[PDB]
């Protein structure tokens, strides 16, 4: 099992149907890495920490990736993720700290910087910095700018250790406080840069092989 065979949103049917839990519509065209499909996706969008499976000698996936209020079980989630019927699956990624910001809207679809990082498709991405907040209006600007994307996101992952910095994302913005989709990163992360957003994404979106 190479890492290429472990992307949670692109698992082969053999690997999927083996997993055991431990206890084109947007183009009107009948083509997924083409730049055409990507703009149409863009146009239409714009208007223990783990769970374990058994198979081929223990695959682990982050609990944060799932929807807590969901009646589906994790196998049902994985199979729905791996079906062409969710081509506009997106998530958001935000880190702020020490005057630095990086945000991105990430597509769940992969592509052709390591090869694993080179396949992360950021539909939008922004990074800026301000000494000191005054960052607050800048970031509230990005959130309004991405409002159509944000209302269609599966998850919105935010790192803001500072209490005033976490307040930046919900104090009178387009995100509401107590939005289930808003979640911490289940692992420590570095400085807010675009590459760090991709590190975080690859860390959430690939199964991990662990001991039982
Ligand atoms: Zn298409």
Swiss-Prot record:
VLRF1 domain mapped to chain residues: 87-207
Annotated consequence of substituting residue 129 to A: Does not affect ability to release incompletely synthesized polypeptides from 60S ribosomal subunit
Quote the disruption phenotype from the UniProt entry.
Leads to progressive mitochondrial failure, hypersensitivity to oxidative stress, and decreased chronological life span.
Here the disulfide bonds are none
Q: What is the effect of changing residue 131 to A?
A: Reduced ability to release incompletely synthesized polypeptides from 60S ribosomal subunit
Location comes to:
Cytoplasm; Mitochondrion; Endoplasmic reticulum membrane
| Domains as described in the record | The VLRF1 domain mediates binding to the 60S ribosomal subunit.
Which protein family is named in the record?
Belongs to the ANKZF1/VMS1 family.
What assembly does the database describe for this protein? Associates with 60S ribosomal subunit. Interacts with CDC48. Interacts with NPL4.
Q: Anything else of interest in the record?
A: Present with 3930 molecules/cell in log phase SD medium.
Which purpose does this protein serve, as stated in its record? Endonuclease that cleaves polypeptidyl-tRNAs downstream of the ribosome-associated quality control (RQC) pathway to release incompletely synthesized polypeptides for degradation. The RQC pathway disassembles aberrantly stalled translation complexes to recycle or degrade the constituent parts. VMS1 acts downstream disassembly of stalled ribosomes and specifically cleaves off the terminal 3'-CCA nucleotides universal to all tRNAs from polypeptidyl-tRNAs, releasing (1) ubiquitinated polypeptides from 60S ribosomal subunit for degradation by the ERAD pathway and (2) cleaved tRNAs for recycling.
UniProt-recorded name of the protein: tRNA endonuclease VMS1
Gene that specifies this protein: VMS1
Which portion of the complete protein is shown here?
A: 13 to 397 of 632
